[PDB]
Design an enzyme around this catalytic site. Structure first.
Site, short mmCIF file in Angstrom:
data_model
loop_
_atom_site.label_atom_id
_atom_site.label_comp_id
_atom_site.label_asym_id
_atom_site.label_seq_id
_atom_site.Cartn_x
_atom_site.Cartn_y
_atom_site.Cartn_z
N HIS A 58 0.74 -1.35 0.03
CA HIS A 58 -0.08 -0.01 0.22
C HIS A 58 0.82 1.25 0.15
O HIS A 58 0.00 2.43 -0.24
CB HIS A 58 -1.11 0.02 1.10
CG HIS A 58 -2.00 -1.17 0.83
ND1 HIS A 58 -2.81 -1.45 0.10
CD2 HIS A 58 -2.27 -2.42 1.87
CE1 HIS A 58 -3.49 -2.45 0.22
NE2 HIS A 58 -2.95 -3.15 1.13
N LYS A 97 -3.53 -10.20 -8.13
CA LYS A 97 -4.40 -9.71 -7.09
C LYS A 97 -5.19 -9.03 -7.53
O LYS A 97 -5.13 -7.82 -8.41
CB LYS A 97 -3.40 -8.89 -6.07
CG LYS A 97 -3.84 -8.46 -4.71
CD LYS A 97 -3.43 -7.87 -3.79
CE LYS A 97 -4.08 -7.63 -2.59
NZ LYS A 97 -4.29 -6.20 -2.14
N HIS A 121 -3.92 -3.27 7.58
CA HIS A 121 -4.73 -3.82 6.55
C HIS A 121 -5.25 -2.29 5.85
O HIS A 121 -5.53 -1.52 6.74
CB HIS A 121 -5.92 -4.63 7.11
CG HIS A 121 -5.47 -5.79 7.63
ND1 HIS A 121 -4.80 -7.09 7.06
CD2 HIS A 121 -5.75 -6.34 8.58
CE1 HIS A 121 -4.78 -7.84 7.79
NE2 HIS A 121 -5.03 -7.63 9.06
N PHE A 122 -5.75 -2.31 4.68
CA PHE A 122 -6.17 -1.28 3.84
C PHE A 122 -7.79 -1.72 3.73
O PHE A 122 -8.01 -2.51 3.14
CB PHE A 122 -5.59 -0.76 2.47
CG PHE A 122 -5.92 0.37 2.04
CD1 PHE A 122 -7.22 0.20 1.30
CD2 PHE A 122 -5.35 1.53 2.26
CE1 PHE A 122 -7.68 1.56 0.56
CE2 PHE A 122 -5.84 3.04 1.77
CZ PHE A 122 -7.03 2.82 0.85
N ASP A 123 -8.68 -1.14 4.55
CA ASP A 123 -10.08 -1.32 4.65
C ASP A 123 -10.97 -0.65 3.46
O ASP A 123 -11.28 -1.30 2.85
CB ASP A 123 -10.72 -0.74 5.82
CG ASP A 123 -11.89 -1.64 6.23
OD1 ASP A 123 -11.68 -2.93 6.40
OD2 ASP A 123 -13.12 -1.25 6.42
CL LIG Z 1 -6.72 -2.55 -1.19
CL LIG Z 2 -1.18 -12.77 -5.81
CL LIG Z 3 -7.56 -4.65 1.02
#
Ligand SMILES: [Cl-]
Ligand SMILES: [Cl-]
Ligand SMILES: [Cl-]
Ligand SMILES: [Cl-]
Ligand SMILES: [Cl-]
Ligand SMILES: [Cl-]
Ligand SMILES: [Cl-]
Ligand SMILES: [Cl-]
Ligand SMILES: [Cl-]
Ligand SMILES: [Cs+]
Ligand SMILES: [Cs+]
Ligand SMILES: [Cs+]
Ligand SMILES: [Cs+]
Length: 124
Positions: free
Chosen positions: A12, A41, A119-121
């Protein structure tokens, strides 16, 4: 092996640029941050602010995480961000991403000592 803090930083943080450069920003970053290794991803957000400013979010507005946890924090200000999402033409191992640049408040989950993002929420 990878710590939760270091995984957050790798997925991130992009303090090297003020904003996404080009429509190919997401193809390059998703690959360079090892986010296309075994699979594409599907969705990932990059934050174009200092690591200190993103870390500081953990002592800003406490808000519920989407999953109902209570360790999420919403940035008091908007931040430069890039959302990277797979396109319909994306087929591993030739992943392809749309780049959308924006200025949004970020919501992160925080943990640990030091109490940092893990974590990115979401963004708003
Ligand atoms: Cl994300
Ligand atoms: Cl991946
Ligand atoms: Cl995420
Ligand atoms: Cl770490
Ligand atoms: Cl810099
Ligand atoms: Cl890596
Ligand atoms: Cl696809
Ligand atoms: Cl790949
Ligand atoms: Cl400690
Ligand atoms: Cs910035
Ligand atoms: Cs493109
Ligand atoms: Cs790399
Ligand atoms: Cs809390």
């Amino acid at each position: 092996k990878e710590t939760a803090a270091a995984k957050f930083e790798r997925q991130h943080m992009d303090s090297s640029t003020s904003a996404a450069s080009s429509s190919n920003y997401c193809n390059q970053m998703m690959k360079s941050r090892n986010l296309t290794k075994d699979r594409c991803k599907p969705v990932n957000t990059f934050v174009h602010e200092s690591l200190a400013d993103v870390q500081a979010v953990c002592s800003q507005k406490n808000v519920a995480c989407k999953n109902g946890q209570t360790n999420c924090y919403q940035s008091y200000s908007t931040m430069s961000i890039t959302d990277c999402r797979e396109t319909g033409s994306s087929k591993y191992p030739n992943c392809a991403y749309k780049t959308t640049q924006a200025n949004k408040h970020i919501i992160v989950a925080c943990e640990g000592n030091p109490y940092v993002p893990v974590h990115f929420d979401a963004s708003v």
